[PDB]
Design a protein around this nucleic acid. Structure first.
Ligand SMILES: [Mg+2]
Ligand SMILES: [Zn+2]
Ligand SMILES: [Zn+2]
Lengths: 69, 115, 391, 49, 56, 147, 140, 42, 262, 32, 184
RNA sequence: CUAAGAGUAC
């Protein structure tokens, strides 16, 4: 849905490393592993936390809001 | 639903104490002390520091059930040595070692420059 | 609830969670797993029903089943494996772990046994510590295959006055077998003492296994290079023999065994050769497996698995059979449109020469799917028919 | 991501399971049991679309 | 067969089962809710007046 | 349940300190019994755990299609290149005492599903309640406080 | 208290078997031609090699004084004197069989917590061994 | 949802996974209960 | 005199050190206390005023609870359970308020930097969310389309990792001893050779390799534990270790106090 | 690649599958 | 796939070549200017065929092209496969992994499992919990269960990106240890 | 409330 704040196993705060990850993947044309290493995710728990996340919220944000002010 | 509150792990309940001692009749000069709202963290530490004592014949602990935070520690010492005294000495030794470690780690961290 | 042991009187222990909790041993009479099973609880509403329930239907009174005049409960799953690991000769326990394991036995008499080794380091053996759980006054003497009064293989079992003199404690001893520790304890000391023995053994062994650890992984399904080469050579030799039999049948030189047709004898010989091929490959793999192999450890303890599981995971899955015969020609004269007509080679009719470690080819995957489908269908039909017969 | 192929009946999504049946206009011959006086039966479930 | 040989009964519970190596062979773990629901009638006796009074 | 038929309920929940931990402090999210592996022969569970470990370390995605030319040997070699034991074993430490476990634990990420069957929707007890109008027996079903 | 048995053996075979910490040794007595020993020893804790001369003793107790187990084992306090101080490798067990091998030779089986020992010889010097608990003491 | 939208039901040895099911229905996708084999998925 | 420490790597969030001349039990107890016995500040109670987003209210509350908060002076705070106020006061809580609106035609990201402390901290160093990245935006709490609004308030109490893992300031704690397996506390699973198939740890360089001929040292105990503590951000990693030692000492002191008073 | 009429590999067929599922979809039979 | 004699190479080969694959790739990339090439174009120029179980009785199918079309030191870790010692193929499987259904296409390494386990997972992934639709907020269904953080599998199949499984995952990657830890 | 049906758990 949206990037989890903390890695489930260890607890490293990885909710602030999603937009940086996407910018690395897009602007710097880095592959996934090098970007994960760059962000500081050395344990494969955090690496699977950030690597396999699916950003469903974009989909949810396409629909017009039910309550619009 | 039936899952109890987490704070019951470390919070003393009403009408019960942290420590309770029951003499053991299987062997002479032996006690079984139930420690409440504790776990392996204190259990292994206290066990090892009791076994470092020379006059402690037997010292062991068990957590009877993972559901409840409490554990039983049996202590049997030589004649003329109250097992409560063994517990006192083990706790004192643990405190002294931890204080020395805290001082040493503080002095070692103060030595860094890239922090 | 197919028998009286599947309905037993228990004692309530109130717990702060949302599931019924029962001992691992008492699952064996109930045929109960923990993968979503549900169980029922009936409460008597009078002192008379309460009393006769406690005095006739109590779990300890049901340990020895009239079904086969042998105990219906035993040491199972982790504990069983753990106990095999605990009673090995190599297993020596230092003072601190001995003290913990002794305290973990509720009825421990309070005296530390003299260690099996006193100098230069006091070490207790696993048998010495486990003998504390066994009640005082129990004599057992079972002689396994090839054992002597000395035990070069540490097999067999000799318990004298509640002390395990020798023998690895495993399924044959603490399991639900006639003449085992469970049967002897319940017949000599009583059902209550047998239940106490269950509790003590499980407690000590589970503590030891918690602080020793037991795992299993992909490497446990891997045989080294020479063994894989020998397994492939065995499969190739079996396939060559099958090809020779097929030649002798197709050249009409094969004679039908008396009482059956030519095709029946040919299929019998092919299936026998392939079955003994998978058996030989599994035996090679099992011999290759070192004593530290985790799947081998589980099989030896008897807690779970068998030789066939090792054979299928490591050496060869084998021949897939439908209705007791090989995979049938669902298409015209052929099993799949990926095989030419009249192809009776082992791969064309469901033989799975690949282990689960190696993975299955698409055709072998489909044939195994058919075999498993037959298994599920037979399970459903059998449970229905057995229910009707039982009623 | 919704794929369709289903109906909305009274606000509930209803799907029609593909019903399997024997094909029509095909001749099928079956061996019968020994006690029955008929040994083989050839049948067609004829139907015109 | 539906109402005489076998019938639906009160004072019964049903739920998922989990293992517990720290329970005795003859013991069963009962959820606190199920214990709070299923009940036993205990006749008031001079020997159990105090505990049943406290439960009340 | 895994993607391999390894259904099972939560026996118990341990906090992070009580779980066994590797030399890098990683504690498992799940502990499953070894005995489910030999009898059920879910080797794909182990292979996919190894492949997930390699994929998480290397940042790629594990190509776990059925009939590809992906071998356990290649996955093990890639895992060895990443500084871990090739067969996925990791020296773990008991969470109660910190002592090394005498046996090395198979360890790695694995894909699990939470199924619709929760205990909150199946616990059901009835001392007394509504009865059936016809036979004066307890009604049927937990949705009716039945017997 | 006093040694029920004492001799000097030479080890002719050490068999690791399927073990990493225990080996089964066969030893021939260098004094008496009919006494022989089979013994499981923790090689991790007391290494034993082939053709190693081992002084092997069996005692009813370890205290130096004569006898006055049923009493709980207690770790040796500093300065405690026992017969084990004269030996390198001390085990404790119970005898569980007295086999009559021949007219003069008898064999005694001891179980040292699952470490098995079988001592065989003429009864004129093995008679002191009886069906009770014994300590096995070994020095190199 | 996808498996339901591609589900086939056979009214009632039809339970056996036939050879002709290769590539037209799933070799291993069917309920464990009384519907085993009768309910198939494309 | 006592345990000796020699730290290898010192960083803002990671400390890698060696803990020598200490028993295994003490090292593991310190590890466990650091994992789960260090008090920390985190968002505990959530009052939702407005939420027109796509995320559920308790979903956002869950995300907010996982936000690390500065806890340098957390010992100056009090637990709300043993405080004299009715629900929450200044001596036992920190009140934050997250107010966001989707006034931009593109997605607007509600970060944790927009969390604003409402209660007067009385000069302490608590309440502030921990920022680590170079961009300056904290954890991505939520996203807003145009016209979406999200107004909410949070009460933050002090909490330990035992009551909930969101209070855990420890992250992963590497813990190792005897890298060469000289104590024989492990039996290495292997196929052909245990030495080759098991990669040498980085700590193997800090101990002498075994001589391959020396007898097993049965009198050798466990010491020289290589430990690497990571810091989520709530407290500096050196303060993580120091507070772990302090909390373990406090536990043993409480044992002594109860024993003596009874 | 460079050769227009070169034989395809096992990886290429997935492209074909993709094209198929671009036109059919997963429920093409119901709609058809 | 359709296989023809292909006299130029002197051996049986798929009628589809790298040019058609390149055109399909170009069309897909344009969707993600050139002449559009869809599955109907393959069906129209005799590149692919539709075969049912009636016609499938009188055909021979190659399981994979790279190993069964060309006429005849190997890796011991690879599974054993046969060549069938025959060249008379009429069609080719587009991919063997397409024999599985929607639910069984989620299984990682299903050929490394016992078949009843694959059946159990196929019947159990329909009970899996994930995101059934992205517009669940505007649907008033009777029951809905949604994972907080659905994660696409670390071990993912090539057939599960047509099922949009990576877009709508139905599980999480949990760090699993296989150990007899506590007996629970 | 009853009946019918469908799916599902062991
Ligand atoms: Mg079950
Ligand atoms: Zn992590
Ligand atoms: Zn307050």
């Amino acid at each position: 849905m949206i990037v989890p704040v903390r890695c489930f196993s260890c607890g490293k705060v990885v909710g602030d490393k999603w937009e940086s990850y996407l910018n690395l993947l897009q602007e710097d044309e880095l592959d996934e592993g090098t970007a994960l290493s760059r962000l500081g995710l050395k344990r494969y728990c955090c690496r699977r936390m950030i690597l396999t996340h699916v950003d469903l919220i974009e989909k949810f944000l396409r629909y017009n809001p039910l309550e619009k002010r | 639903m039936n899952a109890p509150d987490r704070f019951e792990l470390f919070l003393l309940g009403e009408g019960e104490s942290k420590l309770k001692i029951d003499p053991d009749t299987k062997a002479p000069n032996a006690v079984v002390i139930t420690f409440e709202k504790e776990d392996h963290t204190l259990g292994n530490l206290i066990r090892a520091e009791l076994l470092n004592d020379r006059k402690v014949l037997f010292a062991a602990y068990k957590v009877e059930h993972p559901f409840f935070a409490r554990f039983k520690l049996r202590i049997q010492t030589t004649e003329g040595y109250d097992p409560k005294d063994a517990l006192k000495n083990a706790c004192n030794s643990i405190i002294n070692k931890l204080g020395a470690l805290k001082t040493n780690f503080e002095t070692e961290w103060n030595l860094q420059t890239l922090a | 609830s197919l028998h009286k042991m599947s309905m037993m009187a228990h004692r309530v222990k109130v717990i702060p969670y949302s599931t019924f909790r029962l001992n691992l041993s008492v699952t064996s009479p109930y045929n109960a797993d923990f993968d979503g099973d549900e169980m029922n609880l009936h409460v008597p509403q009078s002192e008379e029903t309460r009393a006769e329930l406690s005095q006739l239907c109590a779990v300890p009174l049901q340990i020895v089943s009239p079904q086969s005049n042998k105990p219906c409960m035993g040491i199972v799953q982790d504990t069983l494996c753990g106990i095999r690991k605990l009673t090995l000769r190599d297993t020596f326990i230092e003072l601190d772990q001995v003290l913990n394991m002794l305290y973990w036995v509720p009825d421990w008499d309070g005296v530390i046994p003299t260690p099996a080794i006193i100098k230069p380091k006091p070490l207790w053996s696993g048998k010495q510590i486990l003998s504390v759980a066994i009640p005082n006054g129990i004599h057992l003497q079972r002689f396994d295959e090839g054992t002597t009064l000395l035990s070069p293989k540490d097999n067999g079992m000799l318990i004298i006055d509640g002390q395990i003199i020798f023998g690895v404690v495993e399924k044959k001893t603490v399991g639900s077998s006639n003449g085992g520790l469970i049967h002897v304890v319940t017949r000599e000391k009583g059902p209550q003492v047998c239940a106490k023995l269950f509790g003590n053994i499980q407690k000590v062994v589970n503590f030891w296994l918690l602080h020793n650890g037991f795992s299993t992984g992909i490497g446990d399904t891997i045989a080294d290079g020479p063994t894989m080469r020998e397994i492939t050579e065995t499969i190739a030799e079996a396939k060559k023999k099958v090809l020779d039999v097929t030649k002798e049948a197709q050249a009409n030189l094969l004679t039908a065994k008396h009482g059956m047709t030519l095709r029946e004898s040919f299929e019998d010989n092919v299936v026998r050769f392939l079955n003994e091929a998978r058996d030989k490959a599994g035996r090679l793999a099992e011999v290759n497996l070192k004593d530290l192999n985790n799947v081998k450890q589980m099989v030896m303890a008897g807690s779970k698995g068998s030789f066939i599981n090792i054979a299928q995971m490591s050496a060869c899955v084998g021949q897939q059979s439908v209705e007791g015969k090989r995979i049938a020609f669902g298409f015209v004269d052929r099993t799949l449109p990926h095989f030419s007509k009249d192809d009776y080679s082992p791969e064309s009719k469901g033989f799975v020469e690949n282990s689960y470690l190696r993975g299955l080819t698409p055709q072998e995957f489909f044939f195994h799917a058919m075999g498993g489908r037959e298994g599920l269908i037979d399970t459903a039909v059998k449970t229905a028919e057995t229910g009707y017969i039982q009623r | 991501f919704d794929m369709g192929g289903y109906f909305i009946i009274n606000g509930s999504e209803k799907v029609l399971i593909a019903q399997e049946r024997s094909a029509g206009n095909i001749v099928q011959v079956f061996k019968k049991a020994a006690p029955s006086p008929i040994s083989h039966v050839a049948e067609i479930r004829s139907a015109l679309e | 067969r539906g109402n005489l040989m076998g019938k639906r009964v009160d004072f019964s519970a049903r739920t998922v089962i989990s293992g517990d190596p720290n329970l005795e062979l003859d013991q069963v773990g009962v959820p606190k809710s199920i214990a709070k629901t299923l009940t036993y009638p205990e006749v008031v006796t001079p020997y159990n007046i105090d505990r049943l009074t406290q439960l009340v | 349940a895994s993607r391999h038929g390894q259904k099972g309920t939560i026996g118990i929940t341990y906090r992070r300190e009580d779980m066994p931990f590797t030399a890098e402090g990683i504690v498992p999210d799940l502990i499953i019994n070894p005995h489910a592996i030999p009898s059920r022969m879910t080797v794909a569970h182990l292979i996919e755990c190894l492949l997930s470990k390699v994929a998480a370390l290397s940042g790629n995605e594990g190509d776990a299609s059925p009939f590809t030319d992906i071998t356990v040997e290649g996955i093990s070699k890639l895992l060895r290149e990443h500084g871990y034991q090739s067969r996925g074993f990791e020296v773990m430490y008991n969470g109660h005492t910190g002592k090394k476990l005498m046996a090395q634990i198979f360890f790695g990420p694995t894909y699990y599903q939470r199924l619709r069957h929760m205990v909150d929707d199946k616990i059901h007890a009835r001392a007394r309640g509504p009865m059936q109008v016809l036979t004066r027996q307890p009604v049927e079903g937990r949705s009716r406080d039945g017997g | 208290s006093n040694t029920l048995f004492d001799d000097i053996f030479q080890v002719s075979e050490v068999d690791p078997g399927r073990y990493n910490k225990v080996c089964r040794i066969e030893a021939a007595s260098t004094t008496q031609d009919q006494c022989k020993l089979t013994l499981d020893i923790n090689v991790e804790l007391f290494p034993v090699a082939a053709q190693d001369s081992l002084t092997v003793t069996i005692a009813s107790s370890l205290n130096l004084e004569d006898t006055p187990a049923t009493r709980s084992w207690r770790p040796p306090q500093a300065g405690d004197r026992s017969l084990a101080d004269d030996y390198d490798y001390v085990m404790y067990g119970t005898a569980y069989k007295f086999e009559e091998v021949s007219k003069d030779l008898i064999a005694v089986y001891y179980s040292f917590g699952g470490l098995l020992m079988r001592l065989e010889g003429n009864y004129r010097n093995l008679n002191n061994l009886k069906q009770e608990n014994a300590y096995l003491l070994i020095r190199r | 949802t996808l498996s339901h939208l591609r589900r086939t039901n056979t009214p009632i040895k039809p339970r056996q996974l036939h050879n002709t099911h290769w590539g037209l229905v799933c070799p291993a996708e069917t309920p464990e209960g009384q519907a085993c084999g009768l309910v198939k998925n494309l | 005199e006592g345990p000796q420490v020699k730290i290898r790597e010192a960083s803002k969030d990671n400390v890698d050190f060696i803990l020598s001349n200490v028993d295994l039990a003490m090292a593991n107890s310190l590890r466990r206390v650091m994992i789960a016995e260090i008090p920390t500040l985190a968002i505990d109670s959530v009052e939702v005023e407005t939420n027109t987003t796509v995320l559920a209210d308790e979903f956002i509350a869950h995300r907010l609870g996982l936000i690390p908060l500065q806890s340098m002076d957390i010992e100056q705070l009090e637990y709300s359970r043993d405080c004299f106020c009715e629900d929450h006061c200044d001596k036992c809580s920190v009140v934050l308020t997250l107010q966001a609106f989707g006034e931009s035609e593109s997605t607007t990201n509600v970060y944790s930097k927009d969390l604003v402390i409402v209660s007067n901290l009385m000069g302490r160093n608590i309440g502030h969310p921990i920022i680590q990245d170079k961009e300056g935006n904290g954890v991505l709490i939520c996203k807003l389309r145009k016209g979406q609004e999200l107004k909410l308030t949070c009460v933050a109490k002090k909490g330990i990792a035992k009551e909930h893992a969101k209070w855990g300031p420890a992250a992963a704690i590497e813990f190792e001893y005897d890298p060469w397996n000289k104590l024989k506390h492990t039996d290495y699973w292997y196929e052909q050779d245990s030495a080759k198939e098991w990669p040498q740890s980085k700590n193997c360089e800090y101990e002498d390799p075994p001589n391959e001929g020396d007898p097993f040292d049965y009198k050798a105990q466990a010491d020289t534990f290589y430990m690497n503590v990571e810091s989520v951000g709530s407290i500096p990693v050196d303060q993580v270790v120091v507070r772990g030692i302090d909390t373990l000492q406090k536990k043993v002191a409480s044992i002594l106090l109860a024993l003596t008073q009874m | 690649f460079e050769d227009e009429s070169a034989p395809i590999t096992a990886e290429d067929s997935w492209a074909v599958i993709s094209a198929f599922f671009r036109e059919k979809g997963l429920v093409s039979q119901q709609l058809d | 796939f359709i296989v023809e004699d292909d006299e130029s190479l002197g051996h049986k080969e798929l009628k589809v070549r790298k040019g058609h694959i390149a055109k399909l790739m170009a069309t897909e990339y344009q969707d993600i200017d050139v002449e559009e090439y869809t599955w109907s174009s393959l069906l129209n120029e005799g590149l692919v065929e539709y075969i049912d179980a009636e016609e499938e009785e009188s055909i021979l199918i190659a399981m994979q092209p790279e190993d069964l079309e060309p006429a005849e030191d190997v890796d011991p870790a690879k599974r054993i496969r046969v060549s069938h010692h025959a060249t008379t193929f009429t069609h080719c499987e587009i991919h063997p992994s397409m024999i599985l259904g929607v639910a069984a296409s989620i299984i990682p390494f299903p050929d490394h499992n016992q078949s009843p386990r694959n059946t159990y997972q196929s019947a159990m992934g329909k009970q899996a919990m994930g995101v059934f639709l992205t517009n669940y907020n505007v649907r008033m269904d009777t029951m809905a269960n949604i994972l907080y953080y659905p994660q696409k599998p670390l071990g993912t199949t090539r057939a599960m990106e047509y099922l949009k499984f990576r877009e709508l995952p139905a599980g999480q990657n949990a760090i699993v240890a296989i150990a007899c830890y506590s007996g629970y």
